Amino acid sequence: QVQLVESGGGVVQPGRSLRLSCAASGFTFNTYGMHWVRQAPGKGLEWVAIIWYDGSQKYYADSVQGRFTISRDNHKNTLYLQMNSLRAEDTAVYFCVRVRFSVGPHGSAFDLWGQGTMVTVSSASTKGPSVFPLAPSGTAALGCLVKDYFPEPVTVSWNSGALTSGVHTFPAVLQSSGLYSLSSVVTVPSSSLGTQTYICNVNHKPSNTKVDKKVEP
Amino acid sequence: NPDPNANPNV
Amino acid sequence: VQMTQSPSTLSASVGDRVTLTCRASQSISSWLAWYQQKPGKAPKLLIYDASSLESGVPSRFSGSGSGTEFTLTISSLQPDDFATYYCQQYNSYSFWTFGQGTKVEIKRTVAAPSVFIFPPSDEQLKSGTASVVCLLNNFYPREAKVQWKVDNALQSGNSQESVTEQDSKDSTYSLSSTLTLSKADYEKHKVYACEVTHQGLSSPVTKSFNRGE
Numbered sequence: 001q002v003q004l005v006e007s008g009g010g011v012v013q014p015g016r017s018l019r020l021s022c023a024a025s026g027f028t029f030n031t032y033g034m035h036w037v038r039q040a041p042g043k044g045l046e047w048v049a050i051i052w053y054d055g056s057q058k059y060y061a062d063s064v065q066g067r068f069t070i071s072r073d074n075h076k077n078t079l080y081l082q083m084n085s086l087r088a089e090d091t092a093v094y095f096c097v098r099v100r101f102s103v104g105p106h107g108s109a110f111d112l113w114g115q116g117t118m119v120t121v122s123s124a125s126t127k128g129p130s131v132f133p134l135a136p137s138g139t140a141a142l143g144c145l146v147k148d149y150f151p152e153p154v155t156v157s158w159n160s161g162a163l164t165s166g167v168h169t170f171p172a173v174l175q176s177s178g179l180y181s182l183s184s185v186v187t188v189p190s191s192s193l194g195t196q197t198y199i200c201n202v203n204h205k206p207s208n209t210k211v212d213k214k215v216e217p
Numbered sequence: 218n219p220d221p222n223a224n225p226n227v
Numbered sequence: 228v229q230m231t232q233s234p235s236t237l238s239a240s241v242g243d244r245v246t247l248t249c250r251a252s253q254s255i256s257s258w259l260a261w262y263q264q265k266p267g268k269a270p271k272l273l274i275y276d277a278s279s280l281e282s283g284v285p286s287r288f289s290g291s292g293s294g295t296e297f298t299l300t301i302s303s304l305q306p307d308d309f310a311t312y313y314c315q316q317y318n319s320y321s322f323w324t325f326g327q328g329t330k331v332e333i334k335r336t337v338a339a340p341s342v343f344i345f346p347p348s349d350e351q352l353k354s355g356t357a358s359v360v361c362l363l364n365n366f367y368p369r370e371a372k373v374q375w376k377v378d379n380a381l382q383s384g385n386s387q388e389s390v391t392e393q394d395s396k397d398s399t400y401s402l403s404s405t406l407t408l409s410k411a412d413y414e415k416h417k418v419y420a421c422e423v424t425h426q427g428l429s430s431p432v433t434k435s436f437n438r439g440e
Contacts, residue, residue, distance in 0.1 A: 031226055031227035032225075032226055032227075033224075033225025033226050034225075035323070037323075044313065044325055044326070044327045044328050045262075045264075045270065045313060045315070045325040046325070047322060047323035047324065047325075050221065050225060050323075051225075052225045053225060053226050053227050054227075057219065057221075057225070059221040059322070061322070095269055095270075099225055099226065100272070100275060100281075101226050102224055102226065103224075104224060105223055105224055106222065106223065106224055106258070106319070107222050107223060107224050107225050107226075107317055108224075108275060108276075108317070109260035109272055109275035109276070109281075109315070109317065110260065110262075110270075110272060110315075111272050111275070111281065111282075113269035113270055113271070114269060115268075115269055116269055130351070130354070132348040132350055132351045132358070133348050133350075134345040134348075134360060134362075135345065135346075135348065139341065141341070141343040141362055141364065143345075143362075145348070145351075145358055145360065145405075147351070147358065168364070168391055168401045170389035170390075170391060170401075170403050171389050171390075171391070172389075173387045173388075173389055173405075175387075181387075181405070182389065183360060183389075183403050183405070185362055185364075185401075185403070187341070187364060187365075220319055220320050221320070221322055222258075222317055222318065222319050222320060222321060222322070223319075
């Protein structure tokens with residue numbers, strides 16, 4: 001159907017380059033102006049760059065002028081963003097965006113957006129988490145602290161998945177070290193502390209780190 | 218001084 | 228052109244008429260668009276040219292205004308309309324700038340947090356750092372103040388918080404605050420307290436432990 005599919009995102013060191021791609025299908029891509037728009041973690045939307053339908057004009061946000069170049073392949077129906085001199089501040093989801101068609105002298109709103117591709121810029125080294133119990137002392141709370149890992153994501157389950165009700169796995173916070181940290185918690189009937197065993201299963205695929213930690217009172 | 222907001226479509 | 232949205236959050240129920248406000252720092256005529264975005268997903272255009280309903284968008288969405296003052300109205304909130312809404316200008320010689328969003332969250336009755344405190348684990352202590360975590364569980368509304376006290380000394384700059392998204396079953400939030408100290412600094416003091424102020428609590432609640440006890 002009518003879609004935009006971005007790719008090319010990943011984790012990259014500062015100073016390096018990365019090329020994003022956006023494959024368009026279902027419409028006459030070579031008649032549309034196209035944009036890149038980005039969204040930093042927890043933030044709002046920020047325009048990045050525009051390219052005319054025929055590549056004849058291009059404009060760029062202050063923060064990317066001289067570093068990024070937008071281009072298009074009107075035979076393969078693909079949009080590109082060449083990102084050079086990457087810096088931590090470029091960490092964001094990047095969306096390719098189609099402008100609503102208009103007649104006349106003026107451009108229009110953004111009527112079609114891709115799913116986005118995530119660029120993370122960091123000098124941190126890949127590293128699995130340390131996993132520590134959050135020990136429980138008529139409802140009891142317990143959990144696992146998942147500390148000092150890079151890059152995102154980790155996945156946390158409880159009892160191999162047999163425990164889902166009452167579980168809250170918090171969004172990661174990025175520490176000043178450049179490493180992430182999160183906690184997963186669950187509330188359980190305090191009478192079940194002795195009777196049931198509680199194990200958190202942390203998996204960090206970037207580092208092939210898998211930890212199963214038993215949390216006891 | 219071209220308007221970046223001008224129509225970018227065919 | 229800077230776009231300013233208000234309110235930054237509102238609480239509403241299914242069936243409610245909701246109206247969001249967008250202001251431009253200078254006139255943008257009618258070159259104004261509204262978008263909906265849900266967590267982890269891309270924005271979807273709702274309204275363009277300030278009052279034109281985008282193709283295929285439900286008719287409960289409408290937009291009004293021109294110049295510097297704009298509104299978006301949902302005539303009757305549906306269960307899938309809880310999201311963040313952005314306005315955006317595309318005025319001549321003005322590039323493209325977005326407001327910071329208005330989050331439409333689910334209203335429910337007040338729910339005071341359950342508060343738990345977790346001392347550093349012995350395993351982490353051997354590594355030279357102490358993480359102390361305060362957990363606020365299943366509360367509403369999201370506004371909460373969490374203060375770390377160490378031997379009655381208010382802490383600043385050494386903690387971080389994380390909040391969940393509104394729970395799909397009970398429409399509550401949960402929050403963690405983690406105080407991070409070196410092993411050496413931890414052992415310098417005895418009393419560690421988390422103090423929680425929330426409108427569901429008549430007085431602030433303090434949960435504490437004595438180091439080692």
